[PDB]
């Protein structure tokens, strides 16, 4: 179950790159019921680092940019 929970999160994380073009991290927290943000951001940055999505989740303001195309 815990991996399959993360797999459902992984499913959600892929979609919202097409639903949104940017999103504030504070909005992004409330969208997703989960144990902790400090945990989950790293699991997104992990997925992002393993090239499953492109995000600028780490950023000075602490806000995320999916981007229309960019490259």
């Amino acid at each position: 179950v815990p991996q399959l929970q993360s797999n459902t999160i992984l499913r959600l994380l892929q979609q919202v790159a097409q639903i949104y073009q940017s999103i504030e991290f504070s909005r992004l927290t409330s969208l997703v019921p989960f144990v902790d943000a400090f945990q989950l951001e790293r699991a997104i940055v992990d997925a992002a680092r393993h090239c499953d999505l492109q995000v600028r989740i780490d950023h000075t303001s602490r806000t995320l940019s999916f981007g229309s195309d960019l490259n």
Binding site: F38, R42, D46, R49, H50, C51, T60, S65, N71
Partner: protein, 434 residues
Amino acid sequence: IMQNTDPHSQEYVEHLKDEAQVCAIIERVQRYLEEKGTTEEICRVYLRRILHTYYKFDYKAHQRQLTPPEGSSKSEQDQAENEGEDSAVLMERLCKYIYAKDRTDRIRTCAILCHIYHHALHSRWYQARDLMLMSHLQDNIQHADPPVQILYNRTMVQLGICAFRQGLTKDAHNALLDIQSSGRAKELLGQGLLLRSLQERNQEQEKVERRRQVPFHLHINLELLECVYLVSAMLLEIPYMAAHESDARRRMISKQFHHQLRVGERQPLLGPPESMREHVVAASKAMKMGDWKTCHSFIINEKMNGKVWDLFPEADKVRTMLVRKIQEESLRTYLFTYSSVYDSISMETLSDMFELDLPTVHSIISKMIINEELMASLDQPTQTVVMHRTEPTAQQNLALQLAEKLGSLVENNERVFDHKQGTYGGYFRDQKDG
């Protein structure tokens, strides 16, 4: 006696009790020869007193460092028995006398090796290094007797273990490389014969090699040696393999680590690790993924503690140093592997994710940028690392690798052209330069 008793029987512990009486007899004979002896008899007793002291970790000197004298009053009688001359000061006095009075290059050579071993055993790396370098024994030891070569090999392992205890993973790897890559470490350290070489030797040579074995209480565990070597290789080779995954010129640092990793990757079923080698291979897979917490649980479990880490006189200092080195180099493998996905990262989230101090994180990232290892800029007011989106695509990487290979093919075509133009070179160089 201590070569012919079994190492795992209770009788070994019984015959080791007599070692205290041997040490006391040698002290009685030392004091007697300091008053009446010739300088050549004194230098020989000093070597025998050194020989039973250089391998013993001074728990009394360490206990005297663990209790600073804050405030309880007892007895001037308990002070006179505490004036026991430190094993280190005794070692330094006896060794300096040998260096200044010895007419034989043998006793001097054994004394400097025991002195270096005793500094290395007590974490005193700089003193042990500077004595080893000053000796120039690296060139000369090939012509010394095999028991002195066994002492030198044991002192070189102890220097590598001392460098490792000081977090000097590179110098630890270098000192242990030739000994472990030989596949003959047990013989080079005088700890036994390898059963696979029993088929190729004369029984008379075997009977002389058995007499050259050191007693078991002078052994350095080969599993501890191989664990320290493989962990030192892991911390050097994984950051290098992550940064240079894209390069065609893969410079393997450790051929033995690369062999062990390829053996673990060839097992179709990888169970939970049981062997010390499987634990370091499992940790190496976790460390390539940048997860320091599974790396830590494979290196610091109860099985590896009782097998490797509890064999150290300072287990918790080497544990905390090794945790910090796993965090420091896993932050680097994580940055090398995931740079391609990040546009900006804060140093605050890297401090929280790796449980590392912000000045250390800043110093590592600053050094990767200065080494051209990371294509990033550091914003000082926000404490963010902003990546430069200049990373080559898999097609750009294949073009870069092809450009390096074309440069190597030009360099080799130029070499072949010079060898062709050199003719055929035999008939046109004999009439200009008297």
